[PDB]
Amino acid sequence: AEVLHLCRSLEVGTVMTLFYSKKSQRPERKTFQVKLETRQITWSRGADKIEGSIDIREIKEIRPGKTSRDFDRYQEDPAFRPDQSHCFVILYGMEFRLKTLSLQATSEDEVNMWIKGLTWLMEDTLQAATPLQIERWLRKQFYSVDRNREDRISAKDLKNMLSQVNYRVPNMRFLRERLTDLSGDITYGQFAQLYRSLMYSAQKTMDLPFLETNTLRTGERPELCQVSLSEFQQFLLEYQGELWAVDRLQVQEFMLSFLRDPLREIEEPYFFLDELVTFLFSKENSVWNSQLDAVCPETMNNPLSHYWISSSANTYLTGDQFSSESSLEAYARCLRMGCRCIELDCWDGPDGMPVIYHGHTLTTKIKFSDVLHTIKEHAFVASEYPVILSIEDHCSIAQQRNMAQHFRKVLGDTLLTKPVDIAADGLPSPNQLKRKILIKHKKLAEGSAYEEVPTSVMYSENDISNSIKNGILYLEDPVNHEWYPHYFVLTSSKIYYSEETSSDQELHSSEKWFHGKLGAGRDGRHIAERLLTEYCIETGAPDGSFLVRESETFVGDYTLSFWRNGKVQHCRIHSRQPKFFLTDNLVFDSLYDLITHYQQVPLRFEMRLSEPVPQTNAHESKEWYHASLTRAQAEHMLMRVPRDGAFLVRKRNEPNSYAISFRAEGKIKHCRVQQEGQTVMLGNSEFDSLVDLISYYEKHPLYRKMKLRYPINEEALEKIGTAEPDEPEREHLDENSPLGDLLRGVLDVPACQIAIRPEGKNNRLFVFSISMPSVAQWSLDVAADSQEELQDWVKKIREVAQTADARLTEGKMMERRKKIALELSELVVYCRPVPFDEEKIGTERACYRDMSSFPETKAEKYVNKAKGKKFLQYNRLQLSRIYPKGQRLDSSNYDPLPMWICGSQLVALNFQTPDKPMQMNQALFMAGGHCGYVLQPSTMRDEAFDPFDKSSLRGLEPCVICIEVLGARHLPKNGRGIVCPFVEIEVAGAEYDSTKQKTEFVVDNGLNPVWPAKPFHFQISNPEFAFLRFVVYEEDMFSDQNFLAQATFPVKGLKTGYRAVPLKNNYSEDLELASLLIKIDIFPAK
Ligand SMILES: [Ca+2]
């Protein structure tokens, strides 16, 4: 069909030029291909050596051109200059930040072919059929663990692969023994057949009212008995309630659509029992009614003040508000996900063009024309409804004319200049503002010059902006004395220092086969087999094994040994300064390559060595070890140190059990790790060696967010810099602080005296240590990286000591600020901020155009029993923007449900933060396919509704919902251990409906678990506004609740009967094959 030809042609491959993301790597030439078996894009180092490839499913957008970071980085040097019609970039990822791949071709036709083929492949693979998706998943999981396509995987490989997909295998020789190698141990067909057999057998305990009633359960393992068409014809009418099942033709079409098989297409379609059970979970059985995913033009004709428009704040950023970078990719992603309100913060630019960055903060600056271009490029790709640009300006006034001119010229007709209806008493409906962009700014008053009227912004409370001077200075480490970075802010009379912030953007010895020292002469000869012969008893070396290490009889050489025909030969490697070579063998530049070379050529005198062997006695030599150690001493050393995170390992009396003692929140915790032969485990998780365990946990969390960081030994305590030795000011809480939760201490400048230290500081040279003469034994040494900064900080601090506070009021009342320009202020026609007056609510003196802004703090004083009712009448006619308080330096969001129910529309969030409010915001907009606009229910638009009074609901029909979860399938992994999942259900809404109920937790099963029956009853008084949320938590060995997957749905558009619930991730991105099965019943008016 003129497309398969294109796909197969693309399968051939082509030679592209890759521009690496990292600056160090030079642009290079590679070979690219598309694999249609698993729908992958694969590039190879050479002709057929693949380097990792990517999945077509994750492709989020394809853009032709060179607008990417790598090209701009390399655009300077005139050696790899790109061309506007010979390069493109691929965007992929499942997070807010999208990874990019920058490619260059040789001709335009080649690029056109590639882009068209990839677009079509992505479109086809997106909406596939469940059996096809399962087949592709099997193919990927099989080949990925198969370096070649020979389709050969051993028993150990199958066991490990099963262990890697959240399913333990305690049944030795589990289930079946079809062949058991009685060359390919498990072919693809055998793999798929066994997969379906297991997925059916392990999930047979769930009892259904119709599946097992068809004279089934006789005992046949394959259960060839196929469900007839008529039984489905009746069932779909009985339980599911699909009226479409009345006609046989529609049912038959459904059968064919789900099946997608030609051989069975021509004879009375049927389902086998396994296929039926799999169909239960399929998206075709999804509880969410896909019919609602469209956008109804009827529900887009109300005044704009009613819709719960999306929003975001601090878009240019991509992380914490203090040191995160700024990029246009954030703007693109936010506009794509379905946002309609974004904020711009402008500052004076060196060349007359502003730069967008956070005021008085270490935020990387970006240009303005580039931001405008990105806005124009990604404005109406995901919708056709207006977007509002709120501008925060701090620039000059000539910069204001420049901004206005650039905006007009670039945006052309898309920018508003006239109002749709001057005489209209309400904001025009969204349909009237299709393909438009609104501009929001402080606006100029009816007078002249800078003017807002009150100017009395009396908040003026501590923050990153209203400070004497901020910056990043290092602090010493009492244990090992490393100058980690910290955040310093100089306030009027106090300073604040935060917790460490690490947030940012040999080979032969480390080799597994490298055993290190073994003995001295004869011991090495005999000990060599002592660590191998006793090891191979586990499984047995296939065609022998090998071991190599430093040679004993030959100093400066390595001895090579290998088991062969009941003999362990001894060899030597001649290391001559540098081309290492064996006896009468080709030279090799390194030992690592010397051994590897033998593993490629088929040395089968030529011996080919098998897989290497891991080592065990590697933890003993390390410092963090104690052969003998009792509890009391354990916690004594653990509490001796002043920092939290210290860890150590100790022996335990019963064999093969060790303990890890660590510190957290000023408390001791002990974790028991068991050992068995060639395995270790603190729980369901499995690790090869204790050294491997610590290394994995040295860079990954173990308990809560703590990370093993300080290895503790008597020497470390002896060299301890200071731990409250010989009253300090560590302090706690102090919530009302500039640094929100990041605060770690406080100090008062007036009582401090400053003395510079132009002396031999440890590896530092810019020090202005602070001393406390009032209380002896205090020295707050602070380092820096330049001479000028040290002087600037010191001078500012000294002024504080003799400041002699004389400011008129708290944080000043502001003064001549920007001299607002006419050009920039002329554009705004809607959404012009003004002060908030309570008396105007409900009167004839309030205009619909004006809005107001709340930093969640003056807002939390309106969402209450006394003010909720009055505040509700305000959002009916006017808008109201709510943004997070300045104290939140982690970008943490806030629960907006009270704000939404109260009627506020533009509830801005922080998209970069994957937290519960963001998930709720994403879920709420499902009604419309993320079009960005959702209409308010009819109940909230009545004169008697009250957000905090059940009886006020009047004549709304209540609802009673009965839920019973049967089981899960394909739960994602978390860390290394096997998840012990429990699914908790929650109803969210008003304060008088919110509730949560949790089930029990299954042990060591996450691939297909089923829970004991326990019907759940829920009651809702306001079905129109509610949210049903399933969260699959895991019960770790520390009795804590971690996050695996979530699924939130509005209650309005839900089906009945037996249903499947697809899962997602914390970022609201669909998972693959993960879902739940439930029985749901609704009893309206009962
Ligand atoms: Ca701002």
mmCIF file of C-alpha atoms in Angstrom, residues 515 517-518 527 530 615-628 649-651 656 658 660 675 689-694 711-713:
data_model
loop_
_atom_site.group_PDB
_atom_site.id
_atom_site.type_symbol
_atom_site.label_atom_id
_atom_site.label_comp_id
_atom_site.label_asym_id
_atom_site.label_seq_id
_atom_site.Cartn_x
_atom_site.Cartn_y
_atom_site.Cartn_z
ATOM 1 C CA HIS A 515 41.196 -11.260 41.962
ATOM 2 C CA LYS A 517 46.735 -10.645 45.414
ATOM 3 C CA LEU A 518 46.283 -14.354 46.145
ATOM 4 C CA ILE A 527 44.855 -21.091 46.016
ATOM 5 C CA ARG A 530 40.629 -23.091 45.767
ATOM 6 C CA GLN A 615 34.412 -12.330 43.478
ATOM 7 C CA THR A 616 33.289 -12.521 47.105
ATOM 8 C CA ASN A 617 36.133 -11.537 49.467
ATOM 9 C CA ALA A 618 36.238 -7.894 48.400
ATOM 10 C CA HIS A 619 34.403 -6.270 51.325
ATOM 11 C CA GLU A 620 36.942 -7.475 53.902
ATOM 12 C CA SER A 621 39.766 -5.212 52.720
ATOM 13 C CA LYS A 622 37.533 -2.127 52.791
ATOM 14 C CA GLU A 623 37.513 0.231 55.763
ATOM 15 C CA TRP A 624 33.788 -0.145 56.499
ATOM 16 C CA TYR A 625 34.095 -3.565 58.148
ATOM 17 C CA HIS A 626 34.267 -5.022 61.668
ATOM 18 C CA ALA A 627 34.724 -8.751 62.247
ATOM 19 C CA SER A 628 33.672 -8.497 65.915
ATOM 20 C CA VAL A 649 28.434 -3.167 58.525
ATOM 21 C CA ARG A 650 28.834 -5.703 61.321
ATOM 22 C CA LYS A 651 28.857 -9.472 61.681
ATOM 23 C CA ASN A 656 25.484 -15.990 56.644
ATOM 24 C CA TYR A 658 25.197 -9.559 58.472
ATOM 25 C CA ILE A 660 23.921 -2.724 58.406
ATOM 26 C CA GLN A 675 23.592 -14.700 52.464
ATOM 27 C CA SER A 689 28.121 -9.467 46.610
ATOM 28 C CA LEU A 690 28.175 -7.222 49.660
ATOM 29 C CA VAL A 691 30.587 -4.854 47.915
ATOM 30 C CA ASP A 692 28.095 -4.681 45.049
ATOM 31 C CA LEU A 693 25.313 -4.050 47.571
ATOM 32 C CA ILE A 694 27.134 -1.122 49.167
ATOM 33 C CA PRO A 711 31.944 5.206 56.216
ATOM 34 C CA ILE A 712 32.770 5.254 59.925
ATOM 35 C CA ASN A 713 36.053 4.092 61.442
#
